[model samples]
Target: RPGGDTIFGKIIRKEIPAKIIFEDDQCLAFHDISPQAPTHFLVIPKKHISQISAAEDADESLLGHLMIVGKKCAADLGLKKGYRMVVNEGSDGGQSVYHVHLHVLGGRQMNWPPG
Candidate 1:
């Protein structure tokens, strides 16, 4: 439960308030302030691993749990038709916040070769 320097870390610590949609002991899901779609939210692990590439073998379960939570959050948002789950790794990958987060988006038709 270290690495509490990022903005997301502050949200998890209750130092900043976000529009939370779903939450569990392992992670917290909330609405994205700058949404890309009609239904856009972020799923973040409480443990605070910097990024997916930074994750280790010991973090297997935690990583998988993040996917599960993202899927569930999509369903809760009524995205039964489809959705897109994204994880940006570095600057090139569009990762602004340092903390690992899953971006779940739906409620619209997504295009291929996403920019």
Candidate 2:
């Protein structure tokens, strides 16, 4: 999806159904359909950037806000027991969605060597 929009774009455009968490002009968050843990969700930029490897220096503030936004949503969603956030950069990193996303996982014990 290097030259076109990704599924995230469709979601952002309201072309798809999703369990929305929070959304501002800069970002949006939602519950992941494929839950990886008892608590699972995703945060993504409204503007699609493809992946972390594709992020540019101009994207610093946007990326920074994504973390803050994600954290705020996590707390509001009752992930008070602590959680882990992951960002996959490439195919080797297991990035299925072409659009960049933050995967928030918690609500139970998570293994250290997450493979």
Candidate 3:
């Protein structure tokens, strides 16, 4: 079982296919269904989990793995110079998908005060 029923979960299970760009034993990276920038990618943990808050001290390894993978993902997306990484927390935080995901945005200049 991929754990819970989130959009990411479905993507992992092949129930809903996504344009995947990267994948490994610990994580998966793909394009967002709804993009926010010229080059937008979503890096997610293969295991079903709901947000950064769900991470425990024991999850440090996974956290580090995610970051490493995120950097590689950005590089794969041609964002060597710079890019924006985002993890929306909840409804109030603009998280549309419940599954924990890091949004990698680049390919253009991004503005501050994201709405």
Candidate 4:
């Protein structure tokens, strides 16, 4: 799964460079190509994984690692005050990319119930 062609794969290979804000062995955080907010970032795994739904119980460590990295990243990006983390699931869930990724949006007050 790691070798398949995906948006995250392109970013990982530098085929399409993203403004990386954070990185660790488990994951990488970068500005999304399409920014939705003042501070928009996409946290993606280095290896290929379809989506969170595909994750098994065995992936607990990886899951924890992602969250840990995300918190650290948000804090460093000046989101210590507040921020929002969203994972879109399927076609109806507003998922534009098939690859699994976490969208860390903040830097401004977000209203309840996104449209």
Candidate 5:
């Protein structure tokens, strides 16, 4: 909770609402406001971490935790057909929210270059 305010932070605090599908001490998974695919959701660190562009050394484990949690949520969602995980790094990477979000997307054909 050290990174300060963000929409994600507000969600964690229950100040706002989101359709949370997974939750734990470290992260939370929920449907994206604008889904890209049939099965689209996001897993994010509970705190207000900005971007991967600059993660403090102490946050290394937290980053990996996001992956493990993302995978578990994907499996729970029954993504047997296949799925994708995306972590947008910067504006060039199509990152709109700075809070490090792991996008778990699937349930359809994924195009090359992912563009």
Candidate 6:
């Protein structure tokens, strides 16, 4: 019950512009509008699922694909040392966007217990 054409849906539909770095049939990777790290980007599926908890068991492949894309994007961005991939679930999880997405952060030493 989470799918309802969110902002990320528009991006997938090409209704809005984004600095896309990587893309495939299932998802797309783009730069974050409000970056939290030196290399901050978002990897989102074309299909809207709202959040991780909203995703069904059948979505396992899609979820894994997101992480794969995120990792590839990080390597492409020269995050040789390390990187962090985050999936905020709901409001309490610091998820501003309702669309299920993975935040790929790198290019610097990330502090533990990130804010």
Give the Cα lDDT of each candidate: 0.88, 0.86, 0.81, 0.79, 0.86, 0.88
lDDT score at residue 32, model 5, on the 0-100 scale: 91
The pairs that clash in candidate 2 are none
| TM-score of decoy 1 | 0.94
lDDT tens digits, residue span 45-94, model 6: 88888889889999999999999899888888999999889999888899
lDDT of 6 at 105: 90
Best by TM-score: 1
Give the candidates in order of lDDT, highest first: 6, 1, 2, 5, 3, 4
What is the TM-score ranking, best to worst? 1, 6, 2, 5, 3, 4
TM-score of 4: 0.89
- Per-residue lDDT of model 4, residues 1-115, tens digit only: 3524787887777787778888767788898877788888888888677877888888878877776777788888888668888888888778877777888888888888865
- Tens digits of per-residue lDDT, candidate 1, 34-65, equal 99999999999988788889999999998899
Model 4 alpha-carbon miss at residue 32, Å: 1.2
| lDDT value, candidate 1, whole model | 0.88
Supply every candidate's count of residue pairs whose N, Cα or C atoms clash at under 3 angstroms. 0, 0, 0, 0, 0, 0
How does model 2 fare in lDDT? 0.86
104, model 4: CA deviation in Å? 0.6
Error of 3 at 103 (Å): 0.4
Span of ten consecutive residues with least summed lDDT in model 3:
1-10
lDDT of 5 by residue, 50-110 (tens): 8988789899999999889888888988988888899899978998777889898999988
- Where in model 1 is the C-alpha error above 4 Å? 1-3
Task: Give the range where candidate 6 is weakest over 10 consecutive residues by summed lDDT.
Answer: 1-10
